[PDB]
Write a protein that binds this ligand. Structure first.
Ligand SMILES: O=C(O)CCn1c2ccc(O)cc2c2c3c(c(-c4ccccc4)cc21)C(=O)NC3=O
Length: 256
């Protein structure tokens, strides 16, 4: 062996685990910097999916609100991607700590989260790409800076086949195999991500609560928000994708 991975990096800790691969905090020996490196089993259609993640990274390396890519390589029976390390952890971890402490993101902080990820979405979408798995565990924290990561579901905007993202954040039209307005699926997921940050109960994976949200009804939020902000969230989850704002329209919105 003596892996590129082994030879170029000192592995500090495991930071993430999944159905296909783990993420490690590593120090690159030569440059002294810390990176996040995902190491997954080399896969085929599964390989086409794994490569799209690499291709998406290699074109989305220039935005402040998208995790930067450095390198990808294959060795042994594993594929590796070396990304920017965000030292603030995931949004999902911040939200889970807030949950236990009963102190959530305040309206000002929710607006900042919405605007920052909204700018990341505007960049991705400007590249004729959609993310398709926006949720708190795929937003990373680094002024706080929020950065979209996990490009495992990224596809071109006019794709006729799509890999469906997390059920809790999934827009109905996507579940229905209607891919005419893919960018608005990202918008819908961003609104529910902001709801979670606002202190909501864990979102439903299926059943009747799941359908009511998809009717355009915001889950309960345990804090008072301006009507104008609540109304922006509600329109981002409109059952008609064309009524949801585009990312460009979101980032220029008077509420933000
Ligand atoms: O398990 C999770 O949801 C997060 C794992 N994870 C963490 C945990 C704590 C951190 O401080 C950063 C990260 C982290 C990072 C990334 C990932 C990641 C997700 C998908 C593919 C490749 C890396 C997971 C990733 C990344 O690209 N930059 C990152 O900083």
């Amino acid at each position: 062996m003596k892996s590129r991975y082994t030879t170029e990096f000192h592995e500090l800790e495991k930071i993430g685990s999944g159905e296909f691969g783990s993420v490690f905090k590593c120090v690159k020996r030569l440059d002294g910097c810390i990176y996040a490196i995902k190491r997954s089993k080399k896969p085929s259609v599964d390989e086409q999916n794994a490569l799209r993640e690499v291709y998406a990274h290699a074109v989305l390396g220039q935005h402040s609100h998208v995790v930067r890519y450095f390198s990808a390589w294959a060795e042994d029976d594993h594929m590796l991607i070396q990304n920017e390390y965000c030292n603030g952890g995931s949004l999902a971890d911040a939200i889970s700590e807030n949950y236990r402490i009963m102190s959530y993101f305040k309206e000002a902080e929710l607006k900042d989260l919405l605007l920052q990820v909204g700018r990341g979405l505007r960049y991705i979408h400007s590249m004729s790409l959609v993310h398709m798995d926006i949720k708190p565990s795929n937003i990373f924290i680094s002024k706080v800076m929020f950065k979209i990561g996990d490009l495992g579901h990224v596809t071109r905007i006019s794709s006729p086949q799509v890999e469906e993202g997390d059920s809790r954040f999934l827009a109905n039209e996507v579940l229905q195999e209607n891919y005419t307005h893919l960018p608005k699926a990202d918008i819908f997921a961003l609104a529910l991500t902001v709801v979670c940050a606002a202190g909501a109960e864990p979102l439903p994976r299926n059943g009747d609560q799941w359908h009511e949200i998809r009717q355009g009804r915001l889950p309960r939020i345990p804090q008072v928000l301006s009507q104008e902000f609540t109304e922006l969230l509600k329109v981002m989850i409109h059952p008609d994708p064309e009524r949801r704002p585009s990312a460009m329209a979101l980032v220029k919105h008077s509420v933000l």
